[PDB]
Amino acid sequence: TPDREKALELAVAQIEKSYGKGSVMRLGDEARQPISVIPTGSIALDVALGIGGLPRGRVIEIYGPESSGKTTVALHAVANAQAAGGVAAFIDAEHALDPDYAKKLGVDTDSLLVSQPDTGEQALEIADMLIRSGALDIVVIDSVAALVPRAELEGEHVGLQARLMSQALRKMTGALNNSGTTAIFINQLTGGKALKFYASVRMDVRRVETLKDGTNAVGNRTRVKVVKNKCSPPFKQAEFDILYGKGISREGSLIDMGVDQGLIRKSGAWFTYEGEQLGQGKENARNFLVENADVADEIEKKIKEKLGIG
């Protein structure tokens, strides 16, 4: 107990020195809070990440099935970076982006730099050029699976898509760290076995169940597991709502997390905050919080303070 605690401290200290800050952690530890993070759009996920958002200057992977919510999560990261005066880029080999949807959830699409590269090499090369400029807060790659190698596209064995990624990342990691630019790689299922090791954060996004008012389908309860996290204890998990045409329900995540923390009491169906009533249904509480941004900010501020998130 007594002589051991110092030998263990020493061991951890060496490991941080030799390999870097997050190289080893107890799962019960409090996260080192950075100066600035890129919030995700859900306080739930922000908390699950420890540091209140995605880290700057790092590689991030967000994977999951098609239409899982991963792209939505990436777009919010884009919107929040822009809203903080940042500049954004979207490297697109999927050709699936819906700008009106992006517009609706907060993205300044007009300002958004977009590139539709001819090959995987070019896609990563262009990203690297944007990154080394120093001008970007965030760049998104949609997607890893689509980063097809020139050789394959030119009709010319297979197995070098992995080599391509591996090479690109070795080069890109230093560039991101210096610039402080965040790189989000979206992924299906694969192709990124390099990505798994280079990524500081990995997020597993999935649809849990389908939200609805009656017969008509309004949205999706989404679930994210932070399977890898070099900036705070990993394996944390979050749930939030993605509403068709609207995106992540910030207000719905403030409520969920509000009651999670005791800031919002739930006497019956009624949701309560500081003696005042927010709504009878969860929707009413959600809707109340959209109509009253002041209180929604007030609640958000209280959740950050109680959990220590700058």
Short mmCIF file of C-alpha atoms in Angstrom, two decimals:
data_model
loop_
_atom_site.label_atom_id
_atom_site.label_comp_id
_atom_site.label_asym_id
_atom_site.label_seq_id
_atom_site.Cartn_x
_atom_site.Cartn_y
_atom_site.Cartn_z
CA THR A 1 0.00 0.00 0.00
CA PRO A 2 2.48 2.71 1.10
CA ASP A 3 5.71 1.72 -0.69
CA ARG A 4 3.67 0.49 -3.68
CA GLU A 5 1.77 3.75 -4.28
CA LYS A 6 5.06 5.55 -5.07
CA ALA A 7 6.45 2.82 -7.37
CA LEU A 8 3.15 2.93 -9.30
CA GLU A 9 3.14 6.75 -9.47
CA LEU A 10 6.70 6.49 -10.77
CA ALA A 11 5.63 3.94 -13.36
CA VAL A 12 2.77 6.12 -14.60
CA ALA A 13 5.05 9.18 -14.62
CA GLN A 14 7.61 7.35 -16.79
CA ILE A 15 4.84 6.23 -19.14
CA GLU A 16 3.52 9.80 -19.58
CA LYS A 17 7.07 11.06 -20.12
CA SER A 18 8.01 8.30 -22.57
CA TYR A 19 4.80 8.06 -24.62
CA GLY A 20 2.55 11.06 -23.87
CA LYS A 21 -0.21 12.45 -21.68
CA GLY A 22 -3.04 9.92 -22.07
CA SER A 23 -0.81 6.82 -22.39
CA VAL A 24 -2.21 5.28 -19.18
CA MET A 25 -5.25 6.20 -17.05
CA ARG A 26 -7.45 4.84 -14.31
CA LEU A 27 -11.03 4.68 -15.60
CA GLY A 28 -12.16 6.65 -12.52
CA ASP A 29 -9.88 9.59 -13.30
CA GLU A 30 -10.92 13.16 -14.01
CA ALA A 31 -10.01 14.43 -17.46
CA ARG A 32 -7.44 17.14 -18.08
CA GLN A 33 -9.57 20.01 -19.40
CA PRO A 34 -8.07 21.71 -22.45
CA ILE A 35 -8.40 25.41 -23.37
CA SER A 36 -10.71 24.80 -26.30
CA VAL A 37 -12.58 21.76 -27.56
CA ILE A 38 -15.05 21.34 -30.44
CA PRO A 39 -18.43 20.54 -28.85
CA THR A 40 -20.42 17.68 -30.39
CA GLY A 41 -23.98 19.03 -30.24
CA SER A 42 -24.93 16.75 -27.36
CA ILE A 43 -23.88 17.61 -23.79
CA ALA A 44 -24.30 13.87 -23.14
CA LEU A 45 -21.61 13.01 -25.68
CA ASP A 46 -19.53 16.02 -24.63
CA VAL A 47 -19.53 14.62 -21.09
CA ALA A 48 -18.87 11.05 -22.30
CA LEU A 49 -15.76 12.42 -24.05
CA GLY A 50 -14.54 13.88 -20.72
CA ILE A 51 -13.11 17.06 -22.23
CA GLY A 52 -16.50 18.57 -23.23
CA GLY A 53 -16.12 18.06 -26.98
CA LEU A 54 -13.74 16.70 -29.58
CA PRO A 55 -10.03 17.47 -29.10
CA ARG A 56 -8.18 19.93 -31.30
CA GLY A 57 -5.09 18.87 -33.27
CA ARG A 58 -6.00 15.17 -33.31
CA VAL A 59 -7.28 12.35 -35.48
CA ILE A 60 -10.85 11.25 -34.75
CA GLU A 61 -12.78 8.28 -36.08
CA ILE A 62 -16.57 8.17 -36.06
CA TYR A 63 -17.89 4.86 -37.34
CA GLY A 64 -21.16 2.97 -37.57
CA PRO A 65 -23.73 1.52 -40.02
CA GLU A 66 -25.11 3.55 -42.90
CA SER A 67 -27.47 6.28 -41.68
CA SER A 68 -26.28 5.58 -38.09
CA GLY A 69 -25.85 9.26 -37.14
CA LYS A 70 -22.08 9.50 -37.56
CA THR A 71 -22.28 12.09 -40.38
CA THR A 72 -24.69 14.15 -38.30
CA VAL A 73 -22.23 14.09 -35.40
CA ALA A 74 -19.47 15.22 -37.78
CA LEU A 75 -21.60 18.09 -39.14
CA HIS A 76 -22.30 19.44 -35.64
CA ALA A 77 -18.57 19.41 -34.97
CA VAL A 78 -18.29 21.42 -38.20
CA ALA A 79 -21.05 23.87 -37.16
CA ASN A 80 -19.61 24.44 -33.65
CA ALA A 81 -16.10 25.09 -35.00
CA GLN A 82 -17.46 27.62 -37.52
CA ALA A 83 -19.62 29.29 -34.84
CA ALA A 84 -16.41 29.83 -32.84
CA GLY A 85 -14.94 31.69 -35.85
CA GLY A 86 -13.22 28.61 -37.30
CA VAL A 87 -12.86 27.46 -40.91
CA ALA A 88 -14.00 24.00 -42.11
CA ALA A 89 -13.30 21.53 -44.92
CA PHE A 90 -15.13 18.45 -46.17
CA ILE A 91 -13.22 15.90 -48.27
CA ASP A 92 -15.96 13.98 -50.05
CA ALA A 93 -15.60 10.65 -51.84
CA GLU A 94 -19.16 9.58 -50.96
CA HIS A 95 -21.14 12.36 -52.69
CA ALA A 96 -23.92 12.06 -50.09
CA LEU A 97 -23.83 15.38 -48.22
CA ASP A 98 -27.18 17.17 -47.79
CA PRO A 99 -26.42 20.92 -47.45
CA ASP A 100 -29.99 21.93 -46.49
CA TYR A 101 -29.83 19.45 -43.60
CA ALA A 102 -26.38 20.75 -42.73
CA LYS A 103 -27.75 24.32 -42.90
CA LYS A 104 -30.64 23.41 -40.58
CA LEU A 105 -28.42 21.97 -37.84
CA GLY A 106 -26.04 24.97 -37.85
CA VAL A 107 -23.42 24.57 -40.60
CA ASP A 108 -22.40 27.66 -42.54
CA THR A 109 -22.41 25.80 -45.86
CA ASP A 110 -21.45 28.89 -47.88
CA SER A 111 -18.15 29.18 -45.96
CA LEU A 112 -17.58 25.40 -45.98
CA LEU A 113 -14.68 24.32 -48.17
CA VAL A 114 -15.51 21.16 -50.09
CA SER A 115 -13.43 18.87 -52.27
CA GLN A 116 -14.51 15.87 -54.34
CA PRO A 117 -11.20 14.16 -55.04
CA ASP A 118 -10.32 11.96 -58.01
CA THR A 119 -8.50 9.33 -55.91
CA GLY A 120 -7.77 8.24 -52.35
CA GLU A 121 -4.21 9.56 -52.60
CA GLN A 122 -5.47 12.94 -53.82
CA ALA A 123 -8.16 13.08 -51.11
CA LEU A 124 -5.55 12.64 -48.38
CA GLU A 125 -2.98 14.83 -50.13
CA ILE A 126 -5.50 17.68 -50.41
CA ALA A 127 -6.46 17.26 -46.74
CA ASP A 128 -2.76 17.46 -45.85
CA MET A 129 -2.38 20.68 -47.86
CA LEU A 130 -5.37 22.30 -46.13
CA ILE A 131 -4.03 21.07 -42.78
CA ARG A 132 -0.50 22.51 -43.20
CA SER A 133 -1.94 25.93 -44.12
CA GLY A 134 -2.68 26.38 -40.41
CA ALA A 135 -5.98 28.04 -41.37
CA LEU A 136 -8.35 25.15 -40.57
CA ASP A 137 -10.04 24.35 -37.29
CA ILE A 138 -11.60 21.16 -38.64
CA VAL A 139 -11.56 18.93 -41.70
CA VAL A 140 -13.91 15.99 -42.30
CA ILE A 141 -13.21 12.97 -44.50
CA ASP A 142 -16.29 11.21 -45.88
CA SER A 143 -15.36 8.36 -45.97
CA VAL A 144 -12.47 5.96 -45.31
CA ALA A 145 -14.10 3.18 -47.31
CA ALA A 146 -14.34 5.49 -50.32
CA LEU A 147 -10.61 6.43 -50.35
CA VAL A 148 -9.96 4.19 -53.39
CA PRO A 149 -6.30 3.97 -54.56
CA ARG A 150 -5.35 5.41 -57.99
CA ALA A 151 -3.93 2.04 -59.05
CA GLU A 152 -7.25 0.27 -58.43
CA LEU A 153 -9.19 3.09 -60.12
CA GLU A 154 -6.80 2.99 -63.09
CA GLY A 155 -7.46 -0.74 -63.60
CA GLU A 156 -4.14 -2.09 -62.32
CA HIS A 157 -2.08 -6.11 -55.92
CA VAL A 158 -5.01 -5.32 -53.57
CA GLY A 159 -4.15 -4.63 -49.93
CA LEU A 160 -2.52 -1.23 -50.58
CA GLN A 161 -5.52 0.89 -49.49
CA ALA A 162 -4.34 0.09 -45.96
CA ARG A 163 -0.77 1.08 -46.89
CA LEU A 164 -2.11 4.33 -48.35
CA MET A 165 -3.94 5.19 -45.11
CA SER A 166 -0.96 4.20 -42.97
CA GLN A 167 1.39 6.44 -44.96
CA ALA A 168 -1.03 9.36 -45.08
CA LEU A 169 -1.63 9.25 -41.32
CA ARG A 170 2.07 9.12 -40.34
CA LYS A 171 2.47 12.35 -42.33
CA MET A 172 -0.83 13.90 -41.25
CA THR A 173 -0.45 13.37 -37.49
CA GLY A 174 2.45 15.79 -37.07
CA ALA A 175 0.71 18.33 -39.28
CA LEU A 176 -2.50 18.21 -37.23
CA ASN A 177 -0.64 18.50 -33.89
CA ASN A 178 1.29 21.60 -35.00
CA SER A 179 -1.72 23.33 -36.58
CA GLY A 180 -4.23 22.33 -33.90
CA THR A 181 -6.65 21.22 -36.63
CA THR A 182 -9.10 18.39 -35.88
CA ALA A 183 -9.45 15.67 -38.50
CA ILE A 184 -12.64 13.59 -38.46
CA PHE A 185 -12.57 10.39 -40.52
CA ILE A 186 -15.96 8.81 -41.07
CA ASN A 187 -16.00 5.01 -41.41
CA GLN A 188 -18.38 2.11 -42.23
CA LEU A 189 -18.54 -1.38 -40.62
CA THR A 190 -13.28 -0.77 -42.51
CA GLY A 191 -10.06 0.10 -44.38
CA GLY A 192 -8.78 1.94 -41.29
CA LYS A 193 -6.73 -0.46 -39.19
CA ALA A 194 -4.12 2.31 -39.21
CA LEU A 195 -6.86 4.75 -38.20
CA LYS A 196 -7.69 2.66 -35.11
CA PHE A 197 -4.17 3.30 -33.72
CA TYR A 198 -3.59 6.87 -34.96
CA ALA A 199 -6.99 8.13 -33.74
CA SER A 200 -7.08 9.88 -30.38
CA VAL A 201 -10.84 9.39 -30.21
CA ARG A 202 -12.97 6.63 -31.71
CA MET A 203 -16.76 6.77 -31.61
CA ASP A 204 -19.18 3.91 -32.31
CA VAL A 205 -22.51 5.43 -33.44
CA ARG A 206 -25.73 3.36 -33.79
CA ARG A 207 -29.50 3.86 -34.00
CA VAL A 208 -31.19 2.39 -30.92
CA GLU A 209 -34.90 3.00 -31.62
CA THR A 210 -37.14 5.16 -33.77
CA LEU A 211 -38.87 8.20 -32.22
CA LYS A 212 -42.41 9.15 -33.29
CA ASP A 213 -45.46 11.29 -32.37
CA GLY A 214 -48.09 8.82 -33.60
CA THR A 215 -47.81 6.92 -36.90
CA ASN A 216 -45.25 9.32 -38.46
CA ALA A 217 -41.50 8.94 -37.75
CA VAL A 218 -39.88 12.04 -36.19
CA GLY A 219 -36.30 10.93 -35.49
CA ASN A 220 -33.90 8.45 -33.92
CA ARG A 221 -32.56 7.81 -30.44
CA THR A 222 -28.83 7.58 -31.13
CA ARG A 223 -26.16 5.88 -29.03
CA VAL A 224 -22.45 6.60 -29.10
CA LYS A 225 -19.72 4.66 -27.33
CA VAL A 226 -16.31 6.26 -26.98
CA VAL A 227 -14.38 3.03 -27.57
CA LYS A 228 -11.03 4.84 -27.65
CA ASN A 229 -10.10 8.05 -25.86
CA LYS A 230 -6.56 9.30 -25.31
CA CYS A 231 -7.80 12.53 -23.72
CA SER A 232 -9.99 11.08 -20.92
CA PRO A 233 -11.04 7.66 -19.56
CA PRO A 234 -12.51 5.65 -22.48
CA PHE A 235 -15.50 3.31 -22.88
CA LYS A 236 -17.94 6.04 -21.82
CA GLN A 237 -21.32 5.96 -23.53
CA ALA A 238 -23.95 8.55 -24.49
CA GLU A 239 -27.48 8.70 -25.86
CA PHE A 240 -29.22 11.63 -27.57
CA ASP A 241 -31.93 12.28 -30.16
CA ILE A 242 -31.44 13.06 -33.84
CA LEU A 243 -34.61 14.62 -35.25
CA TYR A 244 -35.38 14.28 -38.96
CA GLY A 245 -34.45 17.51 -40.71
CA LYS A 246 -33.27 19.14 -37.46
CA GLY A 247 -30.31 17.05 -36.22
CA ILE A 248 -29.23 16.49 -32.61
CA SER A 249 -31.69 17.75 -29.99
CA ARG A 250 -29.45 19.94 -27.84
CA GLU A 251 -32.43 20.67 -25.62
CA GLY A 252 -33.33 16.99 -25.33
CA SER A 253 -29.76 16.30 -24.20
CA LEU A 254 -29.90 19.11 -21.64
CA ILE A 255 -33.04 17.53 -20.15
CA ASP A 256 -31.68 13.98 -20.15
CA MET A 257 -28.45 15.13 -18.53
CA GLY A 258 -30.30 17.59 -16.29
CA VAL A 259 -32.19 14.78 -14.51
CA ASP A 260 -29.05 12.61 -14.66
CA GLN A 261 -27.36 15.23 -12.45
CA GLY A 262 -30.30 16.19 -10.20
CA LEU A 263 -30.36 19.76 -11.57
CA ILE A 264 -33.74 18.84 -13.08
CA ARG A 265 -36.19 17.02 -10.80
CA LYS A 266 -38.95 14.81 -12.22
CA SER A 267 -42.01 14.84 -9.91
CA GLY A 268 -44.27 12.59 -12.00
CA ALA A 269 -44.29 13.33 -15.73
CA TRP A 270 -43.61 16.98 -14.85
CA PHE A 271 -40.03 18.17 -15.34
CA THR A 272 -38.92 20.69 -12.73
CA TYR A 273 -36.09 23.21 -12.60
CA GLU A 274 -35.43 25.44 -9.57
CA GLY A 275 -39.05 25.23 -8.38
CA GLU A 276 -40.32 26.21 -11.84
CA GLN A 277 -42.01 23.78 -14.24
CA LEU A 278 -40.53 23.06 -17.68
CA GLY A 279 -43.10 20.66 -19.12
CA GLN A 280 -45.37 17.70 -18.44
CA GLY A 281 -44.08 15.56 -21.32
CA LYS A 282 -40.39 15.27 -22.20
CA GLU A 283 -41.31 16.95 -25.50
CA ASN A 284 -42.91 19.87 -23.65
CA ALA A 285 -39.74 20.28 -21.59
CA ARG A 286 -37.78 20.04 -24.85
CA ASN A 287 -40.06 22.57 -26.58
CA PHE A 288 -40.06 24.84 -23.51
CA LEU A 289 -36.27 24.92 -23.67
CA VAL A 290 -36.22 25.90 -27.38
CA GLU A 291 -38.67 28.77 -26.76
CA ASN A 292 -36.60 29.81 -23.74
CA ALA A 293 -32.94 29.76 -24.82
CA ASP A 294 -31.99 31.73 -21.68
CA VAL A 295 -32.99 28.87 -19.33
CA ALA A 296 -31.53 26.26 -21.71
CA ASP A 297 -28.24 28.17 -21.48
CA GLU A 298 -28.73 28.47 -17.71
CA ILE A 299 -29.18 24.68 -17.42
CA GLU A 300 -26.25 23.98 -19.74
CA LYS A 301 -24.03 26.29 -17.63
CA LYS A 302 -25.07 24.46 -14.44
CA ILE A 303 -24.24 21.02 -15.91
CA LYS A 304 -20.75 22.14 -17.04
CA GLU A 305 -19.94 23.65 -13.62
CA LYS A 306 -21.08 20.57 -11.68
CA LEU A 307 -18.90 18.34 -13.91
CA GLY A 308 -15.97 20.75 -14.40
CA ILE A 309 -16.06 21.51 -18.12
CA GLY A 310 -14.66 24.84 -19.38
#
